[model samples]
Target: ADLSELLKEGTKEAHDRAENTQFVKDFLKGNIKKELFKLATTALYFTYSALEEEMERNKDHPAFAPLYFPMELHRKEALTKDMEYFFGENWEEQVQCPKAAQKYVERIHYIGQNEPELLVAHAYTRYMGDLSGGQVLKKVAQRALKLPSTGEGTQFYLFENVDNAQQFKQLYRARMNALDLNMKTKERIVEEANKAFEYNMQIFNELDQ
Candidate 1:
């Protein structure tokens, strides 16, 4: 397969395989049973703060440019309501998991500020993780819907829906290749990004174990 097709199938398959594992399903059905809505809403709130933190740290860097969206999104005054409404009647339970997870979500922001290298590592490393997680999202969605498709919820795990996710990834990949970024710094960030995902897995394992 070509690179694009490879990425397409590979991501979906990996994500499915991971989601099919006993831990994910059990956790999803039970304690870690957090809905996508909860995570999205809370993430949206924290996103503004996280961007601010990143900008503050990267101010001197040439790449310090903000990659964030419009003010409507940053302020979240409008997007949050649309999202909450989209979650339908289960909004209460849907919002709780992320609210509960608020601190750890901030843990990422804290790490980004204090151990910036780790944060960079995480971004690059998780560049690797998406290949697998994409598939996992698809499978999880299939199971949740008990069919082959879903609508808005698909947005949670999907990158394609994003207007520029593909172009963004392409540019990001090129940026990594160009090495204009401090090599050591970039490596450290990738490392932390990877670790972030690993820590996330451990959290899941601990909850299920």
Candidate 2:
């Protein structure tokens, strides 16, 4: 099987585990408070900052070369806009990454600095989840926060450049499957992908706490 299929099969349990976390359960049911959502979004900003920094730092890596499509997938800028919207002019000063967010950022940075090839797993876990469930989150967030549909605070879910997000996701998956990785490397990527989910679950748990 290819890397995409392998990741889907291998990380299935982890994905389900993340979905069933208390944080996600509250989110899907629109039972979370606006403050909690803001906290989560702030944590997400830190996580994306680390991931995108690594993506830029490792853009030329052979593993990242096949999957380097920053224009379509980058979230740092939009996240910044949303952060400012929610946190006011002193967004940076006010922002604080929770323990889980800090750990997630550290993991992304470590992999980017030392094991750049492992970035593919982080990329898959973060970006694909955004492209998929992030849509639902946008609506849920707007309803929960009573924000307008003008993409004010929810710009993270708005992929303005990519008119067709699903097609782009398929392309991304194809690139992932096409990477020049052996079976052992593929297995390791799958493992890292599972770890990515665990990191996400950690963030949720922290937010829950």
Candidate 3:
């Protein structure tokens, strides 16, 4: 089989094990709801932290100065809307994972201190990671099941809907590959990209196991 087919088959196999595993299914079924909730929130915080730093660093990049902001905000808006729908007014107070938020913020700051373009590239990596989330898989994200409402609640994802987000990505990729920076800086950012993928795989495996 071709690579895409192989990946699809692999995910299917993993999904079956995840759905059948007593611990995994039971865990998703609310037996360990709090732990699952905490892990999800913590992961979001770390993911957002990395993007926030990138946005700050790229404040002057054309990508940042347009009729929109960073792609991370799109995710945050969708998540906030979902939280509000599920939790009502107490959404901010009751649903947030502040400790996770702080940790995420710290991790991004460390990345910024050490290497910068990788931080910008990290935003691109982060966006792809969001696309890999189950919402994208189920198409619930772009459509209106929970998040990414077509109306007032969707600035972040909508920006990507503009005339040239894909073009922006292509240009950004070229910039990353062509940067004259030392190998250390380039590799660290590349490492973060791999870490981003690994993190998603970790989340999937945890859900599966």
- Candidate 1 at 54: error in angstroms? 4.0
Give lDDT for model 2. 0.88
Task: Assess the local accuracy of residue 200 in candidate 1 as a C-alpha lDDT between 0 and 100.
Answer: 50
For model 1, what is the error of residue 83's alpha carbon versus the real structure, in angstroms, after optimal superposition? Answer: 6.7
Clashing pairs in 2: none
Candidate with better TM-score, 1 vs 3:
3
Residue lDDT tens for model 3, 1-209 = 22222323434543454346554444433454434444554446445645665566666654333312454234665555544544565756664444434454565677666555545444654563344343333343234234434433323234444355556555444544444555565445545655444444445444444
Q: Pick the lDDT winner.
A: 2
Whichever of 2 and 3 has more lDDT, that candidate is: 2
lDDT against the true structure, each candidate: 0.45, 0.88, 0.47
Model 2, stretches more than 4 Å misplaced? none
lDDT by residue (1-209, candidate 1, tens digit) is 22223224434544455446566676355333344434534554454345445645654544423322222123333334435545665554554433323554566677756664344333433333443365565466456544335434433344443355556666655544553454455544444444454445544443443
Task: Kindly provide the TM-score of model 3 when superposed on the true structure, using C-alpha atoms.
Answer: 0.54
Ranking by TM-score: 2, 3, 1
What's the lDDT for residue 44 in model 3? 61
Off by over 4 Å in 3: 1-42, 57-74, 96-105, 129-161, 203-209
